[model samples]
Target: QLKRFSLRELQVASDNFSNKNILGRGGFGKVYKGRLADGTLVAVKRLKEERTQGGELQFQTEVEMISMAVHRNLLRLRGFCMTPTERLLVYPYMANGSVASCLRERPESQPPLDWPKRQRIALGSARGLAYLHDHCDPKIIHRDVKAANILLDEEFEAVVGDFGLAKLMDYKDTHVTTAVRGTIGHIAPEYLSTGKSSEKTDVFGYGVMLLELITGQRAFDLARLANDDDVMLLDWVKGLLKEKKLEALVDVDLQGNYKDEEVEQLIQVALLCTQSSPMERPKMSEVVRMLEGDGLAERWEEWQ
Candidate 1:
């Protein structure tokens, strides 16, 4: 059961959709920081206009399905509003912002995420995805999984957001488009080539996201070219690992604060997840086990 909101109410909550209130923006749309009449803080996602065509009922149905996915690490959908011209979704406001913002956009006054928090994020996000893959009816495949979508609450706990919006948008048209819906570097090779996605596709993206967590770099970045490094974070990490440059692979912001053994284990998990063949990747459940320090050594040896 999800609440239905009016466009007018949301507009006021978001201060008439002021630019100053925008929390973040992406291909889907902009999210604004808003406060309801009862003083409950929220994040209101204002979907892009072009993608809102087709049956409103179908959209609401998809929203309901997304709302039903509940886990500590998954962002809860508070409600939605649909009008003839507007489509908006409401979620609890994440005070700490997304992993990407915390990693790269943090103010000078704020310190970088410590190693323990990064490990917790990895485990928490893994558990969340595992639930979606195993516990949910009909199950959900997070078409996109990246540092940007892994939000952090006030406690800095990882909360996976935008879980089903890709499917929600695609379902509108009777004819499925060949266009792939995901970030560039994070997209799995199979999905990019064939416009197909599965749990493994999400595994690949999560693998890349792990690299982002460790290195504090974007999955795809042109800046790496200036240093004669691979523009893709995965490729860069692989190259570094091959050369046994584990220290170089970490974010310099950490300044030698993280443990070496834990970093190696996380890298092993990342490599296992990013294997070129989707069939070779571990299921999300196995990933959760590995992150929790169960069967990682055996799996890594088998992978090797």
Candidate 2:
């Protein structure tokens, strides 16, 4: 069961929804860091105005469904608050923030994520997504999967957040006509054209996420265009790989600390996942196996 918080209690914890407390913003809404009366920390996700329009029962059902998706690598829903005009979800605050923040937003005094930690993040997140796709009763598809959506606990363990949010936001209507919901570079080509998303769409986004982890760069960036480089991370990495410029593709912050073979294997997995045809992409389960030293070489060979 989930705890139902009062709107006033949330406002108190968040300092009346002060802008200073905002941790991040996305299509869904703004996330504010808050502390309970007992001094426990939490991240409160405040859904946008339009998201709160659906019937109360529908909202509650979706919230309960999200709460049911419990896994070590999945973010646990601590509680929620609903009012006639507001909807908020509370979660245990992630100390290290998101993979995106850790990769590029950290202060210079804070060291970059080490190689082993990066590897663990990849495997852990894959396991979380695999569980959602293969084990959940109704099978939740993460319409948006990227580094920004992958949070890091105090120990830097990966936690997949916002898994069922797209469906929650679109509950008022069916999936067919809803506007495509995803980040630009992370979106699959087919999803862009069809406005339909499936497990394969998530796989494509995960592939781009892996590239971000490797390069510590945005999936789409205009700065690269200034240098006449490909603005899309996938294309940039593919170009680098073709020229055998492995050294140039890795995150410089790693300082040549990662294993060469492992890097190659990950790139292979990333490319496989981002294939143009959704049918060509590996399931998250297969991705987990590949990252864990199983069947990757064989699968890579088969792909060729």
Candidate 3:
């Protein structure tokens, strides 16, 4: 399912790799907005050439796993280009940017994300993860699941992206990298300790993302108010929930427009997913049902 494209073609579409056409850039490299000869707009990602064996292995695994699996909730791979010096991936362009950037926007410049939209995004992200965990032929574990990796399309729909650290059970020849791979604040406790990731690990990260959506705060906020707790976001939120401080737990910028019952239910879901014992955590499919209001009473008592 991996389509091969010539480096020259992508370069031509990206206007000779002009900086003005760049959409995003990171440790991997840069992503550019390009128009194909057929007037198709695509996002071209240029990966940094890897000299280490682990980096090369990761690249191959990503291309092999993501290209083969196709889901509406997941980002689709259009094609890729490889040369001695460069590796590039092409994907359909998403016009609305990322959930992280949207949450960071000023309310004066853009409307705050309402409860309905957040609910939809939560469900979409859960479905995407469920597909990777339960429906895929060999099941995939999204080692890195965060708000930044959850992209939004023109309709504000969520599509999970960035599968560089994905784990595929069917790829027997591929060995998982021993080094811990994930965002710092979003890292699951068990993963940090054992350096092993699984579907439950992904659930932990997803729980953190849900907290971010609810509170509009980073997983690890460095610039905290003097009055704010110095502990991790999860600990702080858990404490608030235990104390029945729902109003304080909700994002202040939301202006009290959110539904009270829904907010509490989501808080319970987050807490359940972030359980210290991975065995107690629910699968991604169960998470979908929990978000939809089923089988929540038992786990909801964990904090109580």
Candidate 4:
């Protein structure tokens, strides 16, 4: 259960939502770094009241939904605070910040995130997503699954965050049509064109995330790509893959330190997940098995 805090209590914790305490900004609102009277540190999400339509409803929905979810890899919501004019959510402060910043940062300032650590991050993130898909009472489709949404702890463990755009559905339902909302490159083709989102669409986002991990490339940076022939991240990967130059697809920063076969396996898994046909994508559980070498390479290929 989430503790409900009076507006004044949160105001005191966040130093009156001072600009100096801002940790990050997002579609929902600005997040503030704060300390409680008891010396507990926290990250507080202050909803933008300017968003007049249904903003309060969105806050309540997220609080209720995220409160029901409990997992080591999911960001923990400590509590919430609300008033007619102000709304806020409190979560444990992630000292390491987001996965995006770490991936983009150079090794000099921090220890190099080696291939093994990257692999663990990918797998841990996958498990967190799998939990949401398979275990949640009403299965949730996280519409936005980008590197920025994946947080890291002091140990660099993956923790999925930001449920603002998450969609809930009955297990019996195969899909739902809603206004599409997600990061550009991570958006699935069908969801973009038809506005229908399902587990497979989420899988597509996961595949794009894998590409991000492998290449250390932004999901949609066309200029940095070698050839203008294919602009999309997945399309460029497919092009290199079809030419059987899989090694070229790995992040050059890796400098051949990563295991070749394991990298190839992950690429194959990503290709399966991004298969154009939603029906062809492997379920998250199957994805976990494939990562563990459960022989899904053949199964995934067979679907194609």
Model with the higher lDDT, candidate 2 or 4: 2
Candidate 2, overall lDDT? 0.80
lDDT of 1 by residue, 123-174 (tens): 9999888887777655676777899889999898899987554442232222
2 against 4, candidate with superior TM-score = 4
Model 3 lDDT on a 0 to 1 scale: 0.79
How many angstroms is residue 37 displaced in model 1 relative to the true structure, after the best TM-score fit?
Answer: 1.6
In candidate 4, list every pair of residues with a backbone clash: none
- Clashing residue pairs in candidate 2 are none
Report the lDDT tens digits of candidate 2 across residue range 1-304: 6888998988999999999999998666789999999999999988877854333433464476665577999888888897868888898999999998888666577788998898999999999988877777556667678888899998999998864444432222223334576678787888799877677777888998998888777776423632476345556666677677888878888899999888888888898999897887899999999899898989888877
What local lDDT does model 3 show for residue 210?
A: 89
lDDT of each: 0.80, 0.80, 0.79, 0.79
Q: State how far residue 20 of model 2 sits from its true place (Å).
A: 4.8
User: TM-score order of candidates, best first?
Assistant: 4, 3, 1, 2
TM-score of each: 0.86, 0.85, 0.87, 0.88
Judged by lDDT against the true structure, how good is candidate 4?
Answer: 0.79
Summarize candidate 3's per-residue lDDT along 1-304 as a digit string, tens digits.
5778899999999998999998777777788999998998888988866656655666676678755567888988788888988888888888766677667543347767777888888999999999888777676878889888888888889999878778765534222335677788677788798876677788998998988888777666522521366765667777777788877767777889988888888888888888888888888899999888888887676546
